[PDB]
Amino acid sequence: MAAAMTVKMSYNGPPSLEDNAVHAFATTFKELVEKESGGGIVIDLYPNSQLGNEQQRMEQVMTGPMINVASFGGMETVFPEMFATNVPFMFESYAAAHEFFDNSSFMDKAGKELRSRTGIELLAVVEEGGFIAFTSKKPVRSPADFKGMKFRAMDASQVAMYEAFGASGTPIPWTEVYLALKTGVADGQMNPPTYIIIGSLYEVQDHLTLANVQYSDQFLLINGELLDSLPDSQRQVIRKAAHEANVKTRQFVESQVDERVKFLASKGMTVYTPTAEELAQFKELGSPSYIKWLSGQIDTAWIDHAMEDARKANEAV
Numbered sequence: 001m002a003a004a005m006t007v008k009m010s011y012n013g014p015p016s017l018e019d020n021a022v023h024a025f026a027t028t029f030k031e032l033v034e035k036e037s038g039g040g041i042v043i044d045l046y047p048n049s050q051l052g053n054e055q056q057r058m059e060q061v062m063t064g065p066m067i068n069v070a071s072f073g074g075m076e077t078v079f080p081e082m083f084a085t086n087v088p089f090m091f092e093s094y095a096a097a098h099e100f101f102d103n104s105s106f107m108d109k110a111g112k113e114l115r116s117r118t119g120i121e122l123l124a125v126v127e128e129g130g131f132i133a134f135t136s137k138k139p140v141r142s143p144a145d146f147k148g149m150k151f152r153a154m155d156a157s158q159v160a161m162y163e164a165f166g167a168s169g170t171p172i173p174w175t176e177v178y179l180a181l182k183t184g185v186a187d188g189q190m191n192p193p194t195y196i197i198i199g200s201l202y203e204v205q206d207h208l209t210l211a212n213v214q215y216s217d218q219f220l221l222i223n224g225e226l227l228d229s230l231p232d233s234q235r236q237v238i239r240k241a242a243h244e245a246n247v248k249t250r251q252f253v254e255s256q257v258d259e260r261v262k263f264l265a266s267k268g269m270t271v272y273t274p275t276a277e278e279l280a281q282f283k284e285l286g287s288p289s290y291i292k293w294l295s296g297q298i299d300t301a302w303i304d305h306a307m308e309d310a311r312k313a314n315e316a317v
């Protein structure tokens with residue numbers, strides 16, 4: 001009888017079920033796909049960006065039968081339109097973002113476009129941290145404080161935001177962020193507490209700013225030629241399992257966000273929550289600059305459509 005379908009799955013960070021939201025997602029996803037497909041599909045897990053940096057894994061998922069969990073560092077290479085979903089302060093809550101990423105017509109449209117353009121199918125927008133925070137060696141309270149500073153960027157949109165705040169941005173691969181921050185190349189970076197913990201960044205950063213500037217997510221990608229080659233019941237399994245692992249990983253992320261900040265404090269990290277006025281400054285200077293930069297990379301219709309669907313999601317909840 002025909003062999004079971006073995007499908008490789010690539011993603012960032014260590015295989016700890018306790019700290020890496022993406023590893024928790026993969027683990028649950030593997031179990032559900034195998035249970036639901038009755039052994040017909042087998043998911044082999046490749047943690048730690050083992051098989052390559054963001055751009056490399058994007059190449060791989062486009063050319064070969066596999067799964068990749070990509071960050072914006074990978075997504076920007078073939079689909080910068082997805083940046084439209086990533087405007088600072090776009091979502092007022094985890095519920096709003098879930099509503100947008102699960103139901104909005106933007107995501108239907110973005111999904112079809114990505115598939116026809118790249119041969120990749122988007123299965124889930126994976127929440128893998130709370131709202132993004134800033135780290136640094138010096139206190140950061142407002143955009144004012146960014147003047148003169150060197151920040152690590154994950155993607156070109158992060159570069160753009162730093163600049164708007166008066167700092168410089170430098171793309172550094174995730175696996176090299178600790179190095180960059182210690183050897184002076186960068187003073188700060190942005191991430192939810194999950195990644196600050198998994199990268200042990202508290203050793204080379206001692207200020208944490210809870211600006212909640214962006215929704216933290218990554219992207220479950222599958223080679224579309226693979227997915228389409230599977231019998232219908234196997235395709236639905238992968239899709240249903242992707243959503244089911246997502247709703248469980250969302251609980252994993254959201255219910256531990258306070259204890260993760262508490263943890264960072266106990267590792268010497270001075271934690272700072274911006275005042276309402278300082279937030280409003282982060283937004284009035286951060287959102288319009290972000291959209292102006294993005295307008296020069298993609299058709300603005302994507303921006304209009306994303307802002308509109310975000311407004312509807314914020315209001316629908």
Ligand SMILES: [Cl-]
Binds near residue numbers: 128253
């Ligand atoms: Cl978090």
